[PDB]
Structure formats: C-alpha cells, structure tokens
Design a protein around this nucleic acid. Structure first.
Ligand SMILES: [Mg+2]
Ligand SMILES: [Mg+2]
Ligand SMILES: [Mg+2]
Ligand SMILES: [Mg+2]
Ligand SMILES: [Mg+2]
Ligand SMILES: [Mg+2]
Ligand SMILES: [Mg+2]
Ligand SMILES: [Mg+2]
Ligand SMILES: [Zn+2]
Lengths: 60, 24, 93, 98, 155, 127, 80, 206
RNA sequence: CCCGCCGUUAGUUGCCAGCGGUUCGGCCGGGCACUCUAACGGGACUGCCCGCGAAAGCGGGAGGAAGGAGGGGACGACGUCUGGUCAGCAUGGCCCUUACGGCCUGGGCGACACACGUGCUACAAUGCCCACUACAAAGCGAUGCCACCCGGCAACGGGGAGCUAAUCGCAAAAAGGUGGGCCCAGUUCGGAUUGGGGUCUGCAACCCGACCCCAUGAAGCCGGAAUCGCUAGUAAUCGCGGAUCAGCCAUG
C-alpha cells in the first residue's frame, strides 16, 4: 500500500484497462469489494463496529 | 465426456454454446 | 471399399467409417454422405459400387487427406521451425 | 391509484413506516391496497476472518433490502394531506409512482 | 459409535411387490443414487425370470438370497502372539447385508453385456445352488468350519 | 362437492382437491401417468387413498411445482392424505398410524466453510 | 491458432519509423520494444532488434515470417 | 485469536448501527465513505471531550450527526462558537449540508469507549497499568452496572516481554446474545510501542 | 438466525379452485380462498400414560407437523504454542534518503527431463451420441442483464423491445423421461497434443487469454507401498448462482 502506489485515484490511466480498485482505508488492493470499497479486512472490522448499515452478520 | 468441448455436455460443463449446443 | 488414399473402412455405418480416414472425422463424414446422398446408417458392406465411387470421387476430391495432409502438417511443422520462431523452438523444446 | 413502494434495510422501521402511510390514508381515500410484502434481496458477503492464510475460516455477512408497496387506490384530496408531512422512520426510501 | 448401538433404519416396502428385501436389493444395484434406473434393472430382471423360468419372479429372488446368506464368519482377534481368525455366527441383520451385496457384485463380475440379464440370471443361478454369487458364501463358511485355537480361554 | 389438501416435501408444494368422481386424477394438466412418466415412485403418490380405499370413489385434481418430480410425488402424498381427512376425520385413525399424514422435514443441509459439501471436508497427507 | 479479427496491429512507433526508411531504401539496425506488433511486408529485409527485457536481439525479418510478431524470434527464457 | 466482537455479534438485538440510513447500488460506497470522513474529523478533534459514539443518519442531502460526549461543553464551546467551526468545517468536507447534535454522557463511567480511553491515557502518562485497570474496573463496578472487565495489551511498563493484564467483576457474559454488553477499544501509543486497551461493560438485560 | 405444522396481517404472486367472455399463453372481468411472499405470533415441556430408579434420568406407548437438545447455523472458557501476519492496517528500535524513494517500456511472477499436495476429466454400456419433451432453489443486472429478427456450421456481429426489476432479462437447469443409434473394439469410450481457420475482450493477447470450427485424436482398460471423507437427506451423483472481474487461464 505504498502511498505512491496509491495513485489509482489518478484518473489519467492512459488506458482504462490499467485502472484498479485498491482499498480505501488499507490501500490493500488485493481483494476489494465494489459495493463498499473495502479491503476484505477493512470491511469485516467496520461491519463489526457497526459502521456499515444493514451489514448484519449473516447467518443461516 | 464432459471435457470434450465438442458435444452437448462438453459445452454445458463449459457454459458455452456452439454448433453442438444451439440456443433454441 | 478402398476410398481415400488406399483407405478401406468396413463393416460399420458409413458415416462412422469414413472417419478411419486421416482427414475425415464425424464432421466431414456427415458432410460426405450429406452431399453424396447415401443413407448414413447404411453399412459399407451393403453399399452400391456406384454409391461408393461418388464418395470415392467426392471425399478424395474435396479434402486433402492421408499422406498429403501429413505431408502438409510436418512441412508446416518445419516451416516455423525453419525460422527463429519460438513456437518453433517448441518442436525442439 | 397511487403506487407507494417502500424499500429499506430494516423491517421494524419499515412495516411501521408503511402502516403509517396506511392508517393515515384510511381517513380520506380508498381503503388502500393494504401493506403488501414482496421478496427480499439478500446481499451475502463472505470474508476470510483473519488477514493472511487461514482460508478455512471466513465470516458471514448479509445486507438485506426490504420491500413494501402499500398502494392507495382512488386518491381524494384529503388523502395527500397527512401523507405530505407525517413520517418518522429514518433509513427508509420511498418512491411514489402514480 | 461408542454406545447407543445405532438403530437399523427401516426402508419403505416395494411398489410392485411391497416386500422390504426387494427395495433393499434395488438399493444395492443403484449407483450415485438413481433408483429408477436401478429400479428398472430389477423389475426388468424380474420380468426376464417369468420367461426363462416359469417360477414367479419373487420366489426366485427371495429363494436365491437364503442360499447366499452366510451363517458363520471369521472376525479376527488378537489372542496375543498373532492375528487369529476366530469365527462367529452371523447376526440375521448382517446375513442379508452381505447376501444382497454379494449378488450385485458377482453379477457385475459376469460376462453378459447388460444390467437385468446380469441380475436375473445370477439370481436364477442362485435358486439352484449355483453361481459366482453362491460361490463366495462357500469360500466363506469354510474358513469357519473349524476356527483355530482359543484354549488359553479354558472357561 | 370439493375438499382441499396441501402437502410439501423437499421444497415441493402440492395442492389436492379430491372430488366424488371415479378414479382419474390430473396434475397441472396432463394425467398422473403423463407427468410421472417413467418414474416408479409415482405409484406411491396415491398410496394414501389405497389406505382408505379410494380412486374408486374420489377424483384428484392436483397442481404442483418446486422441488423435482420425486420431491413432488411425496408432496402429493401429503395433500391427498390431508384432503381425505376432511371428508371423514374418522380416517386419520388408520391414515397416520402409517405416517401418511406427516411432513418429511428432511431438507438439503447447507454447504459450509472449509468444507466441500456441507460435511465433506477436503483431504490431507505427508508427515 | 492465431486471431486479431479485422485491422491487424503494428505500433506506429516503428511502423512510421520503418516506412520512413523505405523512402531512402533501407537502414542499419532498428531497436524497438514494440514486440507487441505484428510483422508487415514493408518490414521485410530490414533488421529490427527486439528487446528481451534485457538485451536488444537483432532480428532479421524475412518474407517467410510476416504473419508473426517480432518478439516471436526474440527469445526470453534461457534454460537448463 | 478468538472471541468475536461483542458488539457486532449483538447488532441484531441489544445494540444498533452507528450509521443508520438507506441507499445502495451506486451511492452506498460513496455515501458510506463519507461517514469515515466525518468520524475522522470528529475523532481528531472532540477527543479532550469524550467522543463516545457517532450516530450518522441520512435522508438525502440532510445528514444528522449526533456526537456523544461526556463533556458536551467542549464540543459546544464558549457560548457555542466552536459548534460553529466544526459544524462549518464539516461542510468544507461534505456539501450535503447537515446539522450536528451533542448528547451528554450519563456518567461516562459507564461508556466502554470512555472507560477505556480513561485507562489508555493513564498508561501513556506512565501510570502503573495494573492499577489504572483495577481502578477503572471498580469505578464502573461502583457506578451501577452489573459487570465490568478491562484488558490491556503487552509491553505493560515497557517490559521487554509482551504481557497481558486482567481484572473484572460482576457478570460479563459475551456468549449471551442478549446480555447487551458495551465494548470499546483504546489504543495506546508509547515510547516503547503500542498497547491496546479493551473494556467491556455489562448493563442489565434487554 | 434458517429449515419443519399452524394462525393473524397484507394481497398488481398466486387460481375455472367457484362464475361469463378468450387470439385457452390465467390473456381480460373478478376474487383473495390456495401457492408463494415477509412480518408478528402460537406450538413439545419427557407436560401426558405405562414401567425401571432414592432422585436425576433412562426404555416404550399415545395425541401431534415435529419428541426428548426436531435438522443446521451463529456462538469457540482461563490458557497453550516465544503458533501467523511488521506485505492489510498500526506501532517501538535499526537501516536507506543522485538513493533499499519514484515514473516508464519490455520482461518476470506462466519454462522442465524431474517430486509432492489439492483438484477436474476419464478409462465406458447401472454407458456414450442424436431428436423430442418435464419438474428447482438461491443470486445477478444503467456506465448492466439483453428477449425477438436476419446473418454466419458456430464463437458472434448488425438491428433492436422490456427492466432502475416477485408481476422484464440472464435461463435451457442437468441427471431424468420418450424414440432411436452404437455393440465391446482403444473402439460414435477418452479427450490430451498439434496443425489450420476464425470470433471477442482489451492500447496490446509472442513470451501468457477465453472461445468457435475442422483436422490430429495422445496417456488412459479403474490404479504399488501407503492413504482420505462421510453415520441422511448425509456419502455418491447432477446441474444452476455469486463474489473478484475488460477479459480470463474458476476443473478453485
Ligand atoms: Mg504505508
Ligand atoms: Mg466420445
Ligand atoms: Mg508442435
Ligand atoms: Mg458465510
Ligand atoms: Mg506378533
Ligand atoms: Mg452457546
Ligand atoms: Mg515464530
Ligand atoms: Mg505464482
Ligand atoms: Zn481496507
């Protein structure tokens, strides 16, 4: 998550196919979810703290 | 022969359609 | 029933047989009988010399088969192998 | 025939949400189409628990979208009255389609 | 299964004969859980027996099994020193188990290129004291008509 | 005149309506021997009637959907059974002793984490 | 099995470079990383030095190798 | 590694969402994100006050923001000029145009987040950890509540070894999905490393 | 919390179930009964009867949708291992700061003659191919799902309706069932490899994409020592969905 590498927000990609999601908290661009924009970690946490509306702990 | 890309199954298992698996 | 390049398919529903030919496989087998107009199901031992010939005449004169195909393939296999073609360093590696 | 479709992430603050639109209409317009349900779209999220390795853990997480429809038939002036400004739920989205 | 001794689940009787053993056998022919297919096979094989044989299909079945059912085994034990054979009586719950299992096996072992044929016949072969099916019940109850040294157990 | 009867096995939901007819039974349109074509378990679908002796006094008009044929076969078993009860509650006394009047709550267990098929866990090896 | 569809590609990095050389006939050595580009007739004869991610290997292009794409004669992995 | 978050494990019942509102599809993320921003500002500012929780409700370009503090006067300010700058500073961040409420804390001695930060601070002030702890605990314990429990990370005292401190009274049932247990985590930066502070508080039942 | 019976609420889901019209596709009138929908609520407690016991509890029976924790989740104590992660994030100390900082193109993370792990597809007729025809759940979709027509063997292109979506689309579910073919053979089993053509995505598909079509059609005839999962609607078997995602190596 090198600050520099956090330049996805640099619209100008030269070729859209070069854009990539990146976490919006960890930077951890590995496995992010579009809906929230959260590095799978920076999501299970907020979802626990309760800062993610309706994001209830699933269960069936 | 699920794997045979050229038959009914082969397609299905591959989720594609072609000469051996028309649409309708 | 010598058909393509000295190929003698026999005893099974034609469409299946012509397949034993280097150059014929299900697809062209059908297409063969298709055009030639011969009940696919009919056995080879139960054909009409004429029928057989049309086939003989069509199959052979419609698709490069047997020794000629191989000829082409291997040749093609040298082809790129002749040039510093990587895909050609695969017929080595 | 006022189609009042409600959607939200919570029911205890929806069924009420709608009921209001309901009884508040039972004093002017038609008896309304009552509060109808409608299937709920469940957004399931599966996320491995700790970071790094441990694939076999993962923790569940759902985000459900609740729906309703209400449906006020044959409106009558005094109808659009209370309905104008008399709600109290928060996380509820309302979209009307006459 | 430490304690509680699992309880033998009881299947639902047959539809063409309504008699446990039938399904049970049906079940053994089944593969990947396909009843119907396996079903036709038995019923098919039941038909082929009214012809090639006059005897009703059921009696051929039931009377082919009892000729299979083993009445003795050899549950190995460690009398210490080596691995003894130790033979015992077959609880009637088990006999059936092996019985039908056996048939279905030996059946598929045969040559014929079918399902029923393989089944019907070996049944029939079984209703006369013959068949690869019955062969095994023999090679079995034999390793047990004597046992092998439990004298340290005096009693 | 007409009597209801609903059943539901393995996600299959069925509606039965026995009528003072003669045998004949229809499902969703075609005849029971036209929906349950080859399936042999379709015979059991009408076993509840045979319990009290029907299909010679009552006519069933059924409609099913949701859970695969054999699933529905069983569902119908419940409806019919249930319907029958509504003609003469005096039926149960000899319907239920054979379990005809019971919903098989057996259901597809779910498939969970670190496991192939609900319970089937992956394998291991080496020291 | 090879497919580009309709409108074969060649980076105008060396194309407009290679043609600017056919005006005066030919040239001596052409270094270009554009190994993503296909080979076209107007290229034949010349000598383009593809990159190997490290060194520029002069690749004498010929007629019996135009459908290809430069890099194909530009090895990458030295081995065993 | 174990013991799920008592809060999130209770989000369904005895405990709610810090950000309650609807939307989704093509706004959620943007909107949601917006929340982390506020909470970002409110936290770096209203610290000396006792930020306890940050509810954020929405109804289209009309947010709520209801900061929970112990010393609301600090949030407010002299006559209320600072609730003018924050309230305004919040806009230069979100043009959504929202208000800002401030609910005092009924005895912060019962707000996990606070019972922790309390401890946290002490630690950074180089105070025997074992004490601040036993101290905090008794406080909660002594100010009503049916159960409390404080946990402190390692390096307690700059020890070269990563330890753990306990202390806890009354009942504290993390497994009872009804208990209604308040949780809170205080971080502790320090000259020798980082120390985490966990505080649970158990209140009544429903 | 979800699945099992039931009721209340609510019917632009659902039905000749009851009625008349039909382009008989529930299409329209109409009605909420049933199905379903999603909320609340009732309901099993060894409470009931017999019998063993001091008691708990245990065996059986009855009514019942359900029985002795009805199935499954969610839920993982004080602590263990100096267990994992300073590459998610955070932070103590050390170290680099014409560089262990940063940009770029190309390459590499994808090679092999090797070994192992976890898998898929098989070695066949309780099968495989073709035609016809039947039943599912759970999700997904505006910078998207794409019906319908024509074109092309096809991938797919070009035109183009409906949908911000229980009441439009992805969709045919497959195994199955019905007729028929193949007839035991490396064989209409198996699909690898390779040749050739071609479509699409993407600035670009050589190193390294998927897919369609023809041709080739390999190892493989069920596996040595050893070893794994599963006690039910499970194992086995058969498809369908999603997340990430331009596309895609998902047989995960
Ligand atoms: Mg960083
Ligand atoms: Mg084949
Ligand atoms: Mg080659
Ligand atoms: Mg989950
Ligand atoms: Mg020994
Ligand atoms: Mg528990
Ligand atoms: Mg270590
Ligand atoms: Mg790798
Ligand atoms: Zn993150």
């Amino acid at each position: 998550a090198r600050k520099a590498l956090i330049e996805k927000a640099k619209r100008t990609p030269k070729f859209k196919v070069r854009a990539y999601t990146r976490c919006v908290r960890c930077g951890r661009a590995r496995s992010v979810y579009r809906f929230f924009g959260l590095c799978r970690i920076c999501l299970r946490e907020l979802a626990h703290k309760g800062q993610l509306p309706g994001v209830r702990k699933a269960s069936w | 022969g699920k794997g045979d890309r050229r038959t009914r199954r082969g397609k299905i298992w591959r989720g594609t359609y072609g000469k051996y698996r028309p649409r309708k | 029933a010598r058909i393509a390049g000295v190929e003698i398919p026999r005893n099974k529903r034609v469409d299946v047989a012509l397949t034993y030919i280097y150059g014929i496989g299900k697809a062209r087998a059908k297409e063969a009988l298709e055009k030639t107009g011969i009940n696919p199901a009919t056995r080879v031992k139960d054909l009409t010399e004429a029928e057989v010939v049309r086939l003989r005449e069509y199959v052979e004169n419609t698709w490069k088969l047997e020794g000629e195909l191989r000829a082409e393939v291997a040749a093609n296999i040298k082809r790129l192998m002749d040039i510093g073609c990587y895909r050609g360093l695969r017929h080595r590696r | 025939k006022i189609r009042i479709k409600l959607r939200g992430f919570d029911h205890k603050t929806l069924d009420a949400s709608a009921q209001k639109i309901v009884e508040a209409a039972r004093r002017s317009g038609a008896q309304v189409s009552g509060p109808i349900p409608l299937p709920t779209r469940v957004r399931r999220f599966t996320v491995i628990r700790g970071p790094f390795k441990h694939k076999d853990s993962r923790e569940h997480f759902e985000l459900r979208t609740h729906n309703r429809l209400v449906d006020i038939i044959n409106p009558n002036r005094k109808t659009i009255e209370q309905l104008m400004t008399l709600d109290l739920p928060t996380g509820v989205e309302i979209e009307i389609k006459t | 299964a430490r304690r509680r001794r699992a309880e033998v689940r009881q299947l639902q009787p047959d539809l063409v004969y309504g008699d446990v053993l039938v399904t049970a056998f049906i079940n053994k022919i089944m593969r990947d859980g396909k009843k119907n297919l396996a079903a036709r096979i038995f019923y098919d094989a039941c038909k082929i027996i009214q012809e090639k044989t006059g005897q009703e299909p059921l009696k051929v079945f039931k009377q082919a099994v009892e000729n299979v059912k083993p009445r003795m085994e050899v549950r190995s034990r460690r009398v210490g020193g080596a691995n003894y054979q130790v033979p015992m009586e077959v609880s009637p719950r088990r006999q059936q188990s092996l019985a039908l299992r056996w048939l279905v096996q030996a059946a598929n072992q045969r040559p014929e290129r079918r399902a029923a044929v393989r089944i019907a016949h070996e049944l029939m072969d079984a209703a006369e004291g013959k068949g690869g099916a019955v062969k095994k019940k023999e090679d079995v109850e034999r390793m047990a008509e004597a046992n092998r040294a439990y004298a340290h157990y005096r009693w | 005149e007409q009597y209801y009867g609903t059943g539901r096995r393995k996600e299959a939901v069925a509606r039965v309506f026995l009528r003072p007819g003669n045998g004949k039974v229809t499902v969703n349109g075609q005849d029971f021997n036209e929906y349950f074509q080859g399936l042999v378990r379709a015979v059991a679908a009408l076993e509840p009637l045979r319990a009290v002796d029907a299909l010679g006094r009552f006519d069933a008009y059924i409609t099913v959907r949701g859970g695969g044929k054999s699933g529905q076969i069983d569902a119908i078993k419940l409806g019919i059974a249930r319907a029958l009860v509504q003609y003469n509650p005096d039926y149960r006394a000899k319907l239920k002793p054979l379990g005809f009047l019971t919903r098989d709550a057996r259901v597809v267990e779910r498939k969970k984490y670190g496991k192939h098929k609900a319970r089937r866990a992956p394998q291991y090896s080496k020291r | 099995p090879r497919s580009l569809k309709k409108g074969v590609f060649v980076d105008d990095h060396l194309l407009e470079k290679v043609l600017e050389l056919n005006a005066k006939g030919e040239k001596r050595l052409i270094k270009t990383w554009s190994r993503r580009s296909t080979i076209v007739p107007e290229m034949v004869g010349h000598t383009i030095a593809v990159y190997n991610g490290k060194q520029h290997v002069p690749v004498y292009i010929t007629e019996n190798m135009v459908g290809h794409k430069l890099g194909e004669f530009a090895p990458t992995r030295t081995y065993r | 590694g174990n013991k799920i978050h008592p809060i999130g494990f209770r989000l369904g019942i005895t405990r709610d969402w810090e950000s309650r509102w609807y939307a989704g599809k093509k706004q959620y993320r943007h909107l949601l994100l917006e929340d982390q921003r506020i909470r970002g500002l409110l936290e770096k500012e209203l610290y000396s006050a006792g930020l306890a929780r940050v509810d954020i409700e929405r109804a289209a370009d009309n947010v709520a923001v209801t900061v929970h503090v112990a010393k609301p006067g600090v949030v407010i300010g002299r006559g209320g000029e600072r609730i003018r700058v924050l309230r305004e500073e919040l806009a230069k961040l979100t043009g959504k145009n929202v208000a800002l409420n401030v609910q005092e804390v009924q005895n912060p001695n019962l707000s996990a987040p606070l019972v922790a930060q309390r401890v946290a601070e002490q630690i950074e002030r180089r105070f025997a950890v074992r004490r601040a702890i036993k101290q905090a605990v008794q406080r909660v314990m002594e100010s009503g509540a049916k159960g409390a429990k404080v946990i402190v990370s390692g390096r307690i005292g700059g020890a070269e070894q990563a330890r753990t401190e306990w202390a806890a009274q009354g009942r504290v049932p993390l497994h009872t999905l009804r208990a209604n247990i308040d949780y809170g985590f205080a971080l502790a930066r320090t000259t020798y490393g980082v120390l985490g502070v966990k505080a649970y508080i158990f209140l009544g039942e429903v």
